[PDB]
Amino acid sequence: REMLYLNRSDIEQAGGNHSQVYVDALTEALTAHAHNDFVQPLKPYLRQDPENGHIADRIIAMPSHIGGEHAISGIKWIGSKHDNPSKRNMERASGVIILNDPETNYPIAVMEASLISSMRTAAVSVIAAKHLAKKGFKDLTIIGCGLIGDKQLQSMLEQFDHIERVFVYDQFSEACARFVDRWQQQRPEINFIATENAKEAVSNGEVVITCTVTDQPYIEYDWLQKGAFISNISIMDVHKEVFIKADKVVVDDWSQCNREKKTINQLVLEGKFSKEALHAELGQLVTGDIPGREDDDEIILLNPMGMAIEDISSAYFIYQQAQQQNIGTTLNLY
Amino acid sequence: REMLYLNRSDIEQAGGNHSQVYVDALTEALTAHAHNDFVQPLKPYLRQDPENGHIADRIIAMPSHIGGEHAISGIKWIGSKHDNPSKRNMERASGVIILNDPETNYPIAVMEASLISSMRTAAVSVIAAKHLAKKGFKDLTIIGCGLIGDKQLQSMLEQFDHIERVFVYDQFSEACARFVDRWQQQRPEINFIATENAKEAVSNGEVVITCTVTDQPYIEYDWLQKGAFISNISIMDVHKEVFIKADKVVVDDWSQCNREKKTINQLVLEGKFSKEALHAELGQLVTGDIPGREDDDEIILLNPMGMAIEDISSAYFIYQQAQQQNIGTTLNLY
């Protein structure tokens, strides 16, 4: 019969623009993940030119199902072109999330994807930090000032009112300058420092969030203060030594991280890491199966690959809220 | 910026309802497939209950890219519930196709999927038959009278005006009766015979098309007339002996058919089949790299798993035609 179409403005109007809906949504989805009440096939990458092509040039299909009270299925179909911002003044990433009624498997919603994606990704850092950051941490570091960085920063400030300073670095000086200028105005009672190198930024963060497009690590273990928590959202930034030297290593999904061509799998393929070495999956922290941070000296790394259930749960929550406020465009399927 | 939304009515209005657009679209896509100008990752199945669950209960993600003059990307996200028709009076399958501009990877269209899917699947039979059926064949067999069967029958009659009789069988007597009754009225100058068993139908077809939801073969080799071409659209219907005894075996995509849990892969895993034993991929027939039928005695089997480039090429063609006729709903992405 019908589907609800929700563009980015619709998603914002329905609450998608505040970290809290994503935090609520992921707390629930990560709970279902610890209880194994979900299905989540490996996400395939479509690259139009698989080797002759930049690694941020792909479109990823991300299907998942989450069981429970209000069981939902769906897919995030999210594209990327590295030079969308530099060459076309367009956001790098774009896409759609489709939601499906598990009774019929019929599609019931078509939604813009990149706001939800950046926002659920920021919620991952928020929930991880609730468990893995020093309580009361004052100093946050953001590396990379694109859309992901922006949303990470927004959500952390919304969710942690004890943050006092924010150290920012970007490889592109100008990007950094505009970003801190923007944010110093958004939040005047917080001190934003544009740093001159990555080391200065990292060294000064109690929470360090990576939001770049690198494929060569630059973060060294010895940059990290005792008691640091690093949320390695952009994956490639952290040197291998950090996975080895960190007191605790958390992932979102071990199976999804032990992929052939992955840093963790490589350390495992050598004799430098195992599943036994892994401290926890994130959902296990949420449920209290495994403890989070245990002292203020531990250096803790989160390596989160990204999980379809995060997109699907978030979108479902926003879909319901939109329907509640009569937001969106009703489409006929037939 | 914008996306074109095309529901089923829009797709019909834009030409999607005539086999010719699909035949043109697939001839081109199958050409690009023989020239390896495409990318097509393995299609993952999401099953909410992967073992405790019917095999027609799943949603499949089908991404692909086709290069060339007007290079296009996209995904078909197609769901299925076996008891949608029996229990809910709904079509078994449903879904959406998303199209993407390969320059930016941005989504540019959202389209209803099941009409296009059933229609491209019928075009596969049509193009295969052009190469693999006896020229002038008079007798067509359809097994299974659901939506796939209906579209196969429609497209064959549109494309081959020398068909004189159509033998129909369905496990559900009533389904068959209504189907032939409907079609005898649609096409009075053609003779439709409701058969009493599958053997009677198969035995009398020069072209035999399987359109069921079985997961146990019932078609024996000795039912098949010399000179028969069988388009095994519903895959599971044909006994293994037929892959072995057939003079020629064609597939759409060898890599996609030599999957671990597949009939062909099983024959290969035993010593009963190889890639050398395979006569052709379909695209190779289209381009004239490998010959089609060579005499009127050969018994020929097509085993086509289904390929995302078929959906994407078809949808792109219809998208262009819709835009040409100002058909559809314009959505904003943001």
Ligand SMILES: NC(=O)c1ccc[n+]([C@@H]2O[C@H](COP(=O)([O-])OP(=O)(O)OC[C@H]3O[C@@H](n4cnc5c(N)ncnc54)[C@H](O)[C@@H]3O)[C@@H](O)[C@H]2O)c1
């Ligand atoms: N689940 C997840 O883990 C998840 C989810 C979404 C996005 N991501 C990742 O987030 C990243 C950022 O995405 P985005 O949309 O904001 O990209 P973007 O193009 O908007 O911005 C990336 C920024 O990082 C800067 N940068 C690049 N390399 C750098 C380096 N070596 N040092 C410092 N700065 C550097 C760039 O100049 C740019 O400002 C991507 O890598 C993406 O894959 C991860």
Ligand SMILES: NC(=O)c1ccc[n+]([C@@H]2O[C@H](COP(=O)([O-])OP(=O)(O)OC[C@H]3O[C@@H](n4cnc5c(N)ncnc54)[C@H](O)[C@@H]3O)[C@@H](O)[C@H]2O)c1
């Ligand atoms: N690319 C491809 O190869 C491709 C593409 C699309 C669909 N399909 C397949 O087409 C098939 C039919 O789909 P549909 O949408 O029309 O399903 P449907 O439920 O609409 O109809 C299936 C019909 O077959 C009948 N049937 C079931 N088992 C039978 C048996 N053993 N003998 C005779 N009749 C039997 C049923 O009663 C029903 O009438 C599905 O198996 C689907 O997976 C294949």
